[PDB]
């Protein structure tokens, strides 16, 4: 198993130069490296219901990104998704949160996105 390419998203890059000498393999051209991100949900819900947290990830940069989107609730790691965004492409995700009791609850990621959610 541990030597087989199972059918999931995959990315891959390399640099090529055609020149009279051999350039330093450690040096590369600088490029931007950040994704644009938006989070969005129902700011509220009824005890028992389900919270739907939507995430848009835009990749304006010239390379394939491979990211692990982690959702935290009240500081504790609740869920994670693996994404592969190709260049000049947006990707949308939905997470489903279950079991929130009455009172306010902190929804945040590992992509600098945060939001207080009320439970009537």
């Amino acid at each position: 198993l541990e030597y087989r390419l199972l059918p999931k998203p995959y990315r891959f890059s390399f640099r090529m130069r055609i020149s009279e000498e051999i350039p330093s393999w450690r040096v590369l051209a600088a490029i931007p490296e950040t994704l644009h991100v938006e989070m969005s949900s129902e700011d509220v819900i009824r005890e028992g219901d389900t919270l739907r947290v939507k995430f848009s990830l835009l990749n304006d940069t010239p390379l394939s990104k491979e990211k692990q989107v982690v959702l935290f609730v009240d500081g504790n790691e609740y869920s994670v998704r693996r994404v592969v965004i190709p260049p000049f492409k947006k990707e949308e995700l939905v997470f489903k949160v279950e079991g929130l009791k009455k009172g306010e609850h902190l929804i945040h990621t590992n992509l600098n996105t945060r939001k207080t959610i009320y439970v009537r």
Partner: protein, 121 residues
Amino acid sequence: LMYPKMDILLEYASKKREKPFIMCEYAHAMGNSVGNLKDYWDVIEKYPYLHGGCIWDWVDQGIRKKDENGREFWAYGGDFGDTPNDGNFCINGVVLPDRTPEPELYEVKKVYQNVKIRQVS
């Protein structure tokens, strides 16, 4: 209502209502304050029956007074041997007594502005 949390606003918008919801006082500006002002208005613009409110408040009630050396300061409760007093709880402004803006007034201007611009591409 006065200084309602978000859950309250969202609760009021969750059922048909005959009467519009107004916050006669919200976002208490005492000292270095007025945090999560955009988070209120994201809700007010989205959901029905929410029609805004009034920030507490405009100006800091600080009287002009001189010290022993003679350098000017703004005075508040207990700076006239007056007892019993409630200290600086009369200093709740977005502008200083002389109407000199506190940084928090720049946020109010941003969040109140009437033009909205979105990035398509």
